[PDB]
Design a protein around this motif. Structure first.
Motif, PDB file in Angstrom:
ATOM      1  N   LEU A  40      -3.900  -6.613   5.555  1.00 26.00           N
ATOM      2  CA  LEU A  40      -3.236  -5.523   4.802  1.00 26.00           C
ATOM      3  C   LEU A  40      -3.709  -5.857   3.376  1.00 26.00           C
ATOM      4  O   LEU A  40      -2.928  -6.784   2.945  1.00 26.00           O
ATOM      5  N   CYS A  53      -6.011  -1.302   5.821  1.00 28.67           N
ATOM      6  CA  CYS A  53      -5.607  -2.006   7.049  1.00 28.67           C
ATOM      7  C   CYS A  53      -6.779  -2.148   7.830  1.00 28.67           C
ATOM      8  O   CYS A  53      -7.395  -1.234   8.181  1.00 28.67           O
ATOM      9  N   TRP A  58     -11.232  -1.728  13.945  1.00 35.93           N
ATOM     10  CA  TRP A  58     -10.134  -0.789  13.564  1.00 35.93           C
ATOM     11  C   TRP A  58      -9.886  -0.807  12.277  1.00 35.93           C
ATOM     12  O   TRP A  58      -9.905  -1.888  11.721  1.00 35.93           O
ATOM     13  N   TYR A  60      -7.473   1.558   9.058  1.00 28.93           N
ATOM     14  CA  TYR A  60      -6.458   2.675   8.768  1.00 28.93           C
ATOM     15  C   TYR A  60      -6.325   2.452   7.064  1.00 28.93           C
ATOM     16  O   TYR A  60      -5.846   1.579   6.435  1.00 28.93           O
ATOM     17  N   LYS A 108       9.192  -0.755   3.797  1.00 26.42           N
ATOM     18  CA  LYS A 108       8.509  -2.061   3.008  1.00 26.42           C
ATOM     19  C   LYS A 108       9.420  -2.692   2.283  1.00 26.42           C
ATOM     20  O   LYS A 108       9.913  -2.141   1.286  1.00 26.42           O
ATOM     21  N   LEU A 119       8.022  -0.246  10.983  1.00 22.56           N
ATOM     22  CA  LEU A 119       7.096   1.045  11.560  1.00 22.56           C
ATOM     23  C   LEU A 119       8.129   1.723  12.625  1.00 22.56           C
ATOM     24  O   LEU A 119       8.486   0.811  13.488  1.00 22.56           O
ATOM     25  N   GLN A 128       7.038  -6.305  11.408  1.00 20.72           N
ATOM     26  CA  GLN A 128       5.994  -7.100  11.112  1.00 20.72           C
ATOM     27  C   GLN A 128       6.191  -7.860   9.587  1.00 20.72           C
ATOM     28  O   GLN A 128       6.913  -7.457   8.831  1.00 20.72           O
TER      29      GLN A 128
HETATM   30  C1  LIG Z   1       3.035  -0.417   3.790  1.00 24.09           C
HETATM   31  C2  LIG Z   1       2.245  -0.664   4.825  1.00 24.09           C
HETATM   32  C3  LIG Z   1       2.317   0.291   5.662  1.00 24.09           C
HETATM   33  C4  LIG Z   1       1.272   0.458   6.873  1.00 24.09           C
HETATM   34  C5  LIG Z   1       0.706   1.547   7.234  1.00 24.09           C
HETATM   35  C6  LIG Z   1       0.059   2.023   8.499  1.00 24.09           C
HETATM   36  C7  LIG Z   1      -0.391   0.783   9.410  1.00 24.09           C
HETATM   37  C8  LIG Z   1       0.103  -0.491   8.709  1.00 24.09           C
HETATM   38  C9  LIG Z   1       0.906  -0.584   7.660  1.00 24.09           C
HETATM   39  C10 LIG Z   1      -0.496  -1.630   9.607  1.00 24.09           C
HETATM   40  C11 LIG Z   1      -1.337  -2.587   8.998  1.00 24.09           C
HETATM   41  C12 LIG Z   1       0.588  -1.985  10.695  1.00 24.09           C
HETATM   42  C13 LIG Z   1      -1.549  -0.698  10.745  1.00 24.09           C
HETATM   43  C14 LIG Z   1      -1.993  -1.145  11.719  1.00 24.09           C
HETATM   44  C15 LIG Z   1      -2.625  -0.074  12.561  1.00 24.09           C
HETATM   45  N1  LIG Z   1      -3.419  -0.447  13.540  1.00 24.09           N
HETATM   46  C16 LIG Z   1      -2.835  -0.679  14.896  1.00 24.09           C
HETATM   47  C17 LIG Z   1      -3.011   0.609  15.582  1.00 24.09           C
HETATM   48  C18 LIG Z   1      -4.661  -1.373  13.226  1.00 24.09           C
HETATM   49  C19 LIG Z   1      -5.528  -0.964  12.210  1.00 24.09           C
HETATM   50  C20 LIG Z   1      -2.658   1.071  12.126  1.00 24.09           C
HETATM   51  C21 LIG Z   1      -1.724   1.458  11.079  1.00 24.09           C
HETATM   52  C22 LIG Z   1      -1.055   0.530  10.497  1.00 24.09           C
END
Ligand SMILES: *C/C=C/c1ccc2c(c1)C(C)(C)c1cc(N(CC)CC)ccc1-2
Length: 133
Positions: A40, A53, A58, A60, A108, A119, A128
């Motif tokens: 992250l 991410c 993958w 994001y 967060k 989440l 997490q």
């Molecule tokens: C403050 C951070 C927020 C945030 C938003 C969306 C995602 C994440 C953190 C992660 C790193 C948990 C994450 C992981 C994923 N994938 C799993 C399906 C991996 C790329 C999607 C979205 C977010």
């Protein structure tokens, strides 16, 4: 404890599968995603955030401005349109994603070296913990 800048390495990730299932992520994909190391990276400049991410298969990425609602299309996740909004509740950074799923978003908590991320989707919470690299 309002500074989320940095590269954040995962320490723990609980109920990841339940949260992905609540979003309707394909079951076969979930079992792969459970194996992948997630990194992250956050760039924070005033109200402006750029979040990235990353894993082997993958990615994001999302950019947002605190206090400004934005249309979001979760193209690399569940492929839904939501109206997203990120705000401060004291020192907690809070995202609500209005749309089909109830209770959808994240929170967060930054405590010095550690970032706690919760989440939510439906009745599921994924917890997490990351440490700044
Ligand atoms: C403050 C951070 C927020 C945030 C938003 C969306 C995602 C994440 C953190 C992660 C790193 C948990 C994450 C992981 C994923 N994938 C799993 C399906 C991996 C790329 C999607 C979205 C977010």
């Amino acid at each position: 404890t309002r500074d989320a800048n940095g590269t954040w390495e995962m320490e723990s990730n609980e109920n990841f599968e339940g949260w992905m299932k609540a979003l309707d992520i394909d079951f076969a994909l979930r079992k792969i995603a459970v194996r992948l190391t997630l990194t992250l990276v956050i760039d924070q400049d005033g109200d402006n955030f750029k979040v990235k991410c990353t894993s082997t298969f993958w990615n994001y990425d999302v950019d947002f401005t605190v206090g400004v609602e934005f249309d979001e299309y979760t193209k690399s996740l569940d492929n839904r349109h939501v109206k997203a909004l990120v705000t401060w509740e004291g020192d907690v950074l809070v995202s609500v994603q209005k749309g089909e799923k109830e209770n959808r978003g994240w929170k967060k908590w930054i405590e010095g070296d550690k970032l706690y991320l919760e989440l939510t989707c439906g009745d599921q919470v994924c917890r997490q913990v990351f440490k700044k690299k």
